[PDB]
């Protein structure tokens, strides 16, 4: 409980040294009062979301709409003391945000409560604090009862917390309001009129004469204008407004492509000298929403290329972070976005700051729902009492911001059709108009959609509300865009939410089909932009609707970034947790629709090829090229496939745009896949090259190379660097479908903030060290600490060469001068007897992220280290700075023999794969083609195993493999009947004696005229729960089809469902390719279920019409295959052919002490009755050889580990 630091700064950071606890076994009595002992409670910093830390409970009170993260009640506590420096002056506690139903106590007394929680609030605290110097105990209770939102929201203090220390006479909470009336006219004379409607409050015991000095500061820092008011009395305890006017000569206008701003410093003067100062940054701008010409900033017309977003920052959870929000805005700007529609709740301050700096329009949403709540614990529970306060606070906070151009009142509100809804809307508009009057108020409506093909008539109350608001927004109602403009010329229209399509990264299924909200087995969505919710639209359709109409200001594509929760195409699905709507995945890797929108909006030339190039030989693959170029041709590994081009179509008012004759905005080809490289060139209207892009096929996974966005970060303790882990081919090409487990490791002046891959269907906790790559990529976030230095990140994958990358951490004072911040170390790996390569120039990283390449002098080299196997380091120097370089080089290759195993049995040759691993005793993992030795049938037609030599190609040494006695598979041929066979036997939960179950495979049906064949489940006792049928097999074949026909009578009906299953040999498991049909009582049917090892095949049923019983007519099944068998435990263990000390099942690990520098031991092990043993020869000095064995049929196994140890040097 250290005293808060303070050095005269008006606002003091308060995120340090807090304690947290989450209720798990009922209420924690006595938490609020100081008497509680929180010694055991964990420490942490306040940008924090205790709902992302937890794991995905599928029984969480929040269903799929919420991400399945648990909510509940959490407690926060801080003990602190006020330094004497701040005694006798006003202090207040400010929260920028804390989720639902906050209740804060101080010194064991209720300090206040605030339900809304998406919005900042404050409490006055000076009186409560102990001026005696005692320890003040602050407690915050958060009661985010989980069923409270549609989208995942996090929990706890997810925004920065501050203390505000000011003189008793001080500027108000938001006591500044900079506006430039009539700028549209005054700009003609290069003169920006300014008004400063500042406010000051006096908490002193008696009124004092007060004076204001306000000076507008240029962006660089030089002054621009100054003003000073005549002194007036400030009545004690009340706010006395002031107003000043000034003119700025030749203003620098804020613009999307040039976001300039001015800083205003208001100094309060009492007694002839300053007593308080306030900083507020504004900009000079003027925009108009015209009912005919739409949006236009300054005197320039421009469409509102916008996207909706959610406050969710991704792997960070709900916790705000400046760099993360900045990265999101920068990516969206790179997409060509102009405006951001903020969620359905107010914006974080970091979002507004990023918008101002990068130049993006912002629309603030007030509420997700009015009094009519949408969830049992939603905000509507408190609306009647807190709506005015919340809307007033939001408008007051955002008013000075130049980025904001709107104040949305709500969205998707189900009581908006009632008269009371109109009354509430009028009241809300009035409340908003009280503070701010220079921005329109709007509302997003969806009920106007109706049938999305026709101009739906408008409900009367909706018409009244639309008249009330200044600008009207529409949800998925493109059909009403032009009609309502004709029927209501006064209105101004724009698309609040359009094209709610779904798409996953790296998934390219059903290219030639468009489906409306259809689930799939793999829990994915096609990236061909052909899947959407029923009310949504294809992105091309929505963009075509918006583009053609002048009066429409623009659209806001839903969910620029996907977010946790709301997986609409997979309602109530168990593994699905994250929305698919994202144009950029949760981690931040763009999808292909990113490039579509880039081509559509950004004016720079570019090209992107949609599908990856790792398909099967001889297959036709749909290839689409998003581009704004007039021509494109694909050079398929040397030969041009064919050129396609656009037509420079012009809109009604003459806007030029490109599109094909067919009316498609994207070029397309149908190409038979040929492995190799596929390059595309964009040719301008004259046929001259303007941009290029290529996709090249990848091979086997080779490495895990890491890339960081910003290699230099600030040491403030919160700046982040986003590192991308890519599974890449030996050539360095990212493998399109790579999905492996990556284990990270971070050391230095930084910590692992989180990990991500973007797999919406993965339920792997974000706050963990390891993460499974999805579509060949993964993301690890590292945050700097208070101390300068470097952060080193290490990643490793089983079977692939590891990699490491560095991130340099400089102090905030350093980050304005290009002092040398560090140098990246070259990583090299070469075969034995292979010379190295050191680049003549290496990248030297100054501060300010202004890195560059510089000359390098490399120290002498001794060829001894490369005519051998091992590891070492090489040094160098750089002329520019005294800092030294460094290089790590790995030498590996042929060392010793490598273990391996395979399997066989009677009548079948062993499984001889055509590739062998180059798993030498050094950690090598290269693969090479192998031809295994021929074996005669004398060895194969009996029990036992044998050794087979692997004639590897291109390598000096051959591979040796051992044989298990379990493998069994022959063919996939068709079979009709068996003269002699005992396999076709069946059993069921119940069967009627008068209906033989074995008659279901006679092959006879009663379509024309034949004997009646059926099976009966009728019983006087109801059996509506369900019954199942089973069939056994012992074949070595693959199934071709499956029968599920049905017989019906006065008592029997069709099954409700068929939950087919397979028995590989140890349990029951559901089969793949189910495709169960709806009732089929009329005509024939055919099914082609997946081929699986199905020693016993079983399917469970339930009655289609309950109260009736089950029946069948023909359910023949055909084939099966077998894999596994039996074996025993471990028997042998050795080190360099010797024994081992203290070897027993009980001990976890064993080691052998060796002289220092000794060659790594050869470690071998064997198992009784020739079991599968995962032998692991020693590879390097650090590490231990860990072995695992297969034994018996179930959990029987034991971990055997031998750790190499040495003596001192």
UniProtKB/TrEMBL annotation:
Kindly list the GO molecular function terms attached to this UniProt entry: hydrolase activity, hydrolyzing O-glycosyl compounds
Question: The DUF4982 domain covers which part of the protein?
Answer: 618-691
Domain Bacterial Ig-like intervals:
823-881, 899-955
Q: Report the residue ranges that make up the Beta-galactosidase-like galactose-binding domain in this protein.
A: 989-1083
Task: Give residue ranges for domain Glycoside hydrolase family 2 immunoglobulin-like beta-sandwich.
Answer: 177-285
Q: Tell me if Hydrolase is a UniProt keyword of this record.
A: yes
Where is the Glycoside hydrolase family 2 catalytic domain positioned along the sequence?
292-536
Kindly provide the name given to this protein in its UniProt entry: Beta galactosidase
Species annotation: Niallia circulans (Bacillus circulans)
The gene behind this protein is bga
Give the residues of the full protein shown.
36 to 1244 of 1737
């Amino acid at each position: 409980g250290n005293s808060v630091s303070y050095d005269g700064e008006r606002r003091v950071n308060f995120n340090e040294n807090w304690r947290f606890q989450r209720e798990t076994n009922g209420s924690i009595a006595g938490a609020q009062n100081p008497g509680f002992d929180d010694s055991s409670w964990r420490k942490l910093n306040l940008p924090h979301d205790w709902s992302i830390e937890l794991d995905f409970n599928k029984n969480s009170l929040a269903t799929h709409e919420g991400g399945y993260l648990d909510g509940g009640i959490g407690w926060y506590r801080k003990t602190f003391t006020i330094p004497e420096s701040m005694k006798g002056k006003r202090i207040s506690l400010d929260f920028d945000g804390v989720y639902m139903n906050s209740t804060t106590y101080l010194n064991g007394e209720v300090l206040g409560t605030y339900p809304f929680g998406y919005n900042a609030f404050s409490y006055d605290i000076s009186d409560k604090l102990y001026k005696d110097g005692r320890a003040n105990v602050l407690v915050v209770k958060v009661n985010n009862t989980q069923p409270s939102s549609r989208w995942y929201s996090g929990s706890g203090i997810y925004r920065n917390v501050y203390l505000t220390v000011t003189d008793p006479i001080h500027v108000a909470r938001y006591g500044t309001f900079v506006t430039t009336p009539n700028l549209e006219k005054s700009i003609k004379e290069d003169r920006a009129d300014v008004n400063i409607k500042t406010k000051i409050s006096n908490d002193a015991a008696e009124a004092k004469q007060v004076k204001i000095k306000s000076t507008i500061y240029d962006g660089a820092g030089n002054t621009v204008q100054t003003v000073e008011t005549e002194e007036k009395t400030a009545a004690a305890g009340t706010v006395t407004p002031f107003e000043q006017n000034t003119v700025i000569k030749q203003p620098k206008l804020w613009s999307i492509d040039k976001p300039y701003r001015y800083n205003l410093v208001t100094e309060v003067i009492v007694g002839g000298q300053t007593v308080d100062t306030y900083e507020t940054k504004f900009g000079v701008r003027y925009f108009k929403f015209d009912e005919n010409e739409g949006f236009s900033l300054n005197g320039e017309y421009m469409k509102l290329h916008g996207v909706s977003m959610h406050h969710d920052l991704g792997a960070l959870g709900a916790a705000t972070n400046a760099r993360g929000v900045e990265r999101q805005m920068q990516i969206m700007k790179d997409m060509g976005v102009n405006a951001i529609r903020v969620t359905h709740n107010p914006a974080s301050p970091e979002l507004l700051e990023a918008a101002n700096k990068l130049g993006l329009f912002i629309i603030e949403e007030a509420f997700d729902s009015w009094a009519q709540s949408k969830k049992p614990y939603d905000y509507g529970r408190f609306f009647n009492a807190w709506a005015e306060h919340d809307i007033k606070e939001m408008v007051d906070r955002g008013k000075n911001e130049p980025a904001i151009i709107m104040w949305s009142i709500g969205n998707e509100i189900y009581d908006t059709t009632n008269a009371a809804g109109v009354e509430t809307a009028r009241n809300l508009v009035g409340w908003v108009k009280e503070i701010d009057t220079t921005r329109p108020t709007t509302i997003g409506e969806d009920k106007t959609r109706g049938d999305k093909v026709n101009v739906t008539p408008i409900n009367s109350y909706i018409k009244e509300i639309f008249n009330i608001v200044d600008v009207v927004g529409l949800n998925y109602s493109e059909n009403n865009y032009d009609g309502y403009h004709k029927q209501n010329p006064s209105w101004k229209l724009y698309g609040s939410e359009t094209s709610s399509a779904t798409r996953s990264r790296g998934v390219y299924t059903h290219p030639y089909q468009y489906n409306q909200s259809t689930k799939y087995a793999d829990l994915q969505q096609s990236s061909y932009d052909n899947d959407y919710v029923g009310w949504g639209r294809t992105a091309e359709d929505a963009w075509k609707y918006d583009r053609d109409l002048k009066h429409i200001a623009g659209q806001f594509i839903w969910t620029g970034f996907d977010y946790i929760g709301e997986p609409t195409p997979y309602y109530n699905s168990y593994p699905a947790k994250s929305s698919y709507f994202g144009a950029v995945d949760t981690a931040g890797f763009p999808k292909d629709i990113f490039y579509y929108y880039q081509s559509q909006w950004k004016k720079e030339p570019m090209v992107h090829l949609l599908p990856h190039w790792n398909w099967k030989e001889g297959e036709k693959v749909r290839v689409l090229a998003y581009t704004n170029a007039s021509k494109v041709e694909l050079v398929l590994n040397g030969e041009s496939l064919g050129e396609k081009n656009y037509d420079n179509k012009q809109t009604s008012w003459g806007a030029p745009y490109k599109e094909t004759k067919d009316g498609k905005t994207y070029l397309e080809w149908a190409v038979p896949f040929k492995p190799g490289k596929l390059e595309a060139v964009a040719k301008d209207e004259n046929g001259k090259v303007i941009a290029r892009d290529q996709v090249v096929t990848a091979g086997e996974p080779a490495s895990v190379r890491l890339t960081a966005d910003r290699k230099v970060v600030k040491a403030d303790g919160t700046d982040l660097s986003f590192i991308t882990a890519d599974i890449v081919d030996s050539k360095g090409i990212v493998v399109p479908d790579a999905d492996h487990l990556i284990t990270f490791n971070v050391t230095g002046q930084g910590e692992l903030a989180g990990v991500d891959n973007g797999n919406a269907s993965s339920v792997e906790r974000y706050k963990d060290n390891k993460r499974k790559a999805f579509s060949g990529k993964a993301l690890a976030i590292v945050q700097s600490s208070k101390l300068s230095g470097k952060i080193t990140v290490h990643a490793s994958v089983a079977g692939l060469s590891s990699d490491s990358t560095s991130v340099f951490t400089v102090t905030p004072a350093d980050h304005d001068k290009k002092i040398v911040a560090g140098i990246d170390d070259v990583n090299l790996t070469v075969d034995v007897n292979e010379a190295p390569k050191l680049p003549s120039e290496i990248k030297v990283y100054y501060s300010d992220e202004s890195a560059a390449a510089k000359n390098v002098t490399w120290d002498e080299v001794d060829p001894k280290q490369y005519s051998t196997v091992g590891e070492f380091t090489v040094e160098g120097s750089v002329e520019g700075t005294s800092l030294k370089a460094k290089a790590f080089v790995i030498v590996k290759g042929i060392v010793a023999v490598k273990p391996y195993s395979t399997a066989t049995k009677v009548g079948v040759q062993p499984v001889l794969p055509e590739k062998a691993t180059l798993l030498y005793s050094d950690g090598t993992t290269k693969g090479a083609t192998v031809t295994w030795d021929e074996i005669p049938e004398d060895k194969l037609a009996k029990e036992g195993r044998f050794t087979v030599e692997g004639s590897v190609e291109g390598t000096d040494l051959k591979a040796n493999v051992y044989v298990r006695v379990t493998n069994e598979v022959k063919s996939v041929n068709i079979m009709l009947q068996e003269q002699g066979s005992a396999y076709p036997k069946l059993e069921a939960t119940f069967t009627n004696p008068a209906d033989n179950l074995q008659h279901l495979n006679d092959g006879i049906k009663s379509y024309t005229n034949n004997p009646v064949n059926r099976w009966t489940n009728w019983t006087r006792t109801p059996r509506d729960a369900g019954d199942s049928i089973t069939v056994n097999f012992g074949k070595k074949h693959v199934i071709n089809n499956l029968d599920l026909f049905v017989f019906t009578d006065s008592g029997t009906v069709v099954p409700e469902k068929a939950e087919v299953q397979y028995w590989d040999g140890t349990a029951w498991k559901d089969v793949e390719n189910l495709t169960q049909p709806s009732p089929y009582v009329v005509e024939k049917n055919e099914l082609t279920f997946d081929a699986v090892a199905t020693e016993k095949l079983k399917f469970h049923l339930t009655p289609s019409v309950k109260g009736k019983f089950l029946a069948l007519t023909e359910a023949e099944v055909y084939a099966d295959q077998i894999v596994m068998g039996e074996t025993a435990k471990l028997q042998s263990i050795t080190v360099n052919g010797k024994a081992l000390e203290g070897f027993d099942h009980a001990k976890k690990n064993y080691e052998l002490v060796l002289p220092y520098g000794s060659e790594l031991p050869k470690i071998e092990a064997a198992a009784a009755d020739n079991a599968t043993v995962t032998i692991l020869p020693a590879f390097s000095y650090p590490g231990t050889a860990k072995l695992f064995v297969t034994s018996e049929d179930g959990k029987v196994t034991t971990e055997y580990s031998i750790g190499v140890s040495t003596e001192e040097p």
